[PDB]
C-alpha cells in the first residue's frame, strides 16, 4: 500500500503531521504531494511553517495514473489549503476515481471535506469542521457531529483535535491487526 | 507572552505541530529555534519532513538573553531530537533558569522530559513516553501514567497522541479563560 498526503499553501500543520507520522510509524510508504507552483516544492503551511513536499502534482498526468501509484489519498484542512485543494480539478478527479473502489481509500479532514461537495460525491453522511458545516449542508449532505465518519471508502473528520483519530481510521483500513495495535500503542492515545 | 519551540534534527512532527498550531491560533508569538549543525536552518524531522526553523539558537548569546526574549520554552520529542535537545547545555540552562520562576513556563513531551534529568530539575513527578519511563524514573522522578502532568511551572506529556492536550495545558497557563475557551472550541477536541 502507498499513501499520498496532498498539501497546498495554507494546509494545516496539525492535520498534515498526524497522518504523516502515523503512516511513517506503520512503515507504509507515504509521499507528500504539493498542489501549487513553487518550483522547489516549498510550501507555506496554514500557521506559517515552511516545509518541503516530496512531489508536485504536476508529475502525475491523470487520476488513472495516480490510481496506479497510490492506494490512499488524504486531503488535509486549514482554511486556505482546503480551498485550494477542493478547487483543483486534478484533486477532484482523483477523488471521483477513488470513490467506491475496493482497494482504495480517501480521507478528508476539517475544511478538506468541502472536496466531497466539489467532486460531486453522493455519500449520504459526512463531517468536517463546524465552520464549513453550513457549506456542506447547502450541498445536500447530512452533517454528523462526531470525530470521524466513514461512508463507503470515504473517511471524514472534524478538526485538528481529531487528526490523530482520523489518521488511525485510515491506517485501520490497510494495516494488519498486529501492525495497527502496535502503532496505536506507540502513540500514547489519551 | 513569547514562546520558543525548540527543534532539532529528529524532532517529532506531531509534537512540534500541536503546540505550534495552538499558540498560533491564540495569536501568541512563537518562534521555532533550531539546535543543530545545518547552517540554513533546514531541519530533518523524525519522520523525514524537511522544514525550516525561524531561528538558530546560535543567534541567542546566552541563557540570560534567552530569558529576556521568551517566557515559555517547549521541548518536543522524537528519539533523536530529544537526545540532541536534552544534551545541549543552552537548552538545559534555559530550563534551569525558567524552573519555578514567576511567569515562565516549560513544556517537555515524549522523550523531551529526559531534559529534566540532564538539567537537574528537582521536580518530584514527571511523565513521558512509556519507552523512556525507566530512564525518567532513573533520575529519581515518580512517573505518572497520564497524558499530562503539571508540577510548579513544568508541563510534561506522554506521546504524539497527547500533543494536543500538552499544547493546550501550556496555553491554559498563560491565556485568559475566555481566550483559552475560544481556542479550545476551535480545535474540535474529541
From Swiss-Prot, chains A, B:
CDD domains: GATase1_DJ-1. It is found in: Cytoplasm; Nucleus. Changing residue 110 to A: Nearly completely abolishes enzymatic activity. One of its GO terms (molecular function) is glyoxalase III activity. Keywords: Cytoplasm, Lyase, Nucleus, Stress response. Changing residue 15 to A: Nearly completely abolishes enzymatic activity. Signal peptide: none annotated. It catalyses: methylglyoxal + H2O = (R)-lactate + H(+). GO terms for biological process: cellular detoxification; glyoxal metabolic process; response to oxidative stress. InterPro entries: Class_I_gatase-like (IPR029062), DJ-1/PfpI (IPR002818), Prot/Nucl_acid_deglycase (IPR050325). One of its GO terms (cellular component) is cytoplasm. Pfam families: DJ-1_PfpI. The active site is at residues 15, 110, 129. Its EC number is 4.2.1.130. Belongs to the peptidase C56 family. Catalyzes the conversion of methylglyoxal (MG) to D-lactate in a single glutathione (GSH)-independent step. May play a role in detoxifying endogenously produced glyoxals. Involved in protection against reactive oxygen species (ROS). This is Glutathione-independent glyoxalase DJ-1. It comes from Schizosaccharomyces pombe (strain 972 / ATCC 24843) (Fission yeast). The gene is hsp3106.
Amino acid at each position: 500500500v502507498k499513501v499520498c498526503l496532498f498539501v497546498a499553501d495554507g494546509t494545516d500543520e496539525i492535520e498534515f503531521s498526524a497522518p504523516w507520522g502515523i503512516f511513517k510509524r506503520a512503515e507504509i510508504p507515504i509521499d507528500s504531494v504539493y498542489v501549487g507552483e513553487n518550483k522547489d516544492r516549498l510550501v507555506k503551511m496554514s500557521r506559517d511553517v515552511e516545509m518541503y513536499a516530496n512531489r508536485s502534482y504536476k508529475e502525475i498526468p491523470s487520476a488513472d495514473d495516480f490510481a496506479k501509484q497510490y492506494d490512499i489519498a488524504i486531503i488535509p484542512g486549514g482554511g486556505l489549503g482546503a480551498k485550494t485543494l477542493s478547487t483543483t480539478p486534478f484533486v477532484q478527479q482523483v477523488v471521483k476515481e477513488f470513490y467506491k473502489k475496493p482497494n482504495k481509500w480517501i480521507g478528508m479532514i476539517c475544511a478538506g471535506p468541502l472536496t466531497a461537495k466539489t467532486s460531486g460525491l453522493p455519500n449520504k453522511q459526512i463531517t468536517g469542521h463546524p465552520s464549513v458545516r453550513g457549506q456542506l449542508e447547502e450541498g445536500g449532505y447530512k452533517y454528523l457531529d462526531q470525530p470521524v465518519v466513514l461512508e463507503e471508502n470515504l473517511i471524514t473528520s472534524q478538526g485538528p483535535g481529531t487528526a490523530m483519530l482520523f489518521g488511525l481510521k485510515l491506517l485501520e483500513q490497510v494495516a494488519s491487526k498486529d501492525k495497527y495495535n502496535a502503532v496505536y500503542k506507540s502513540l500514547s492515545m489519551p
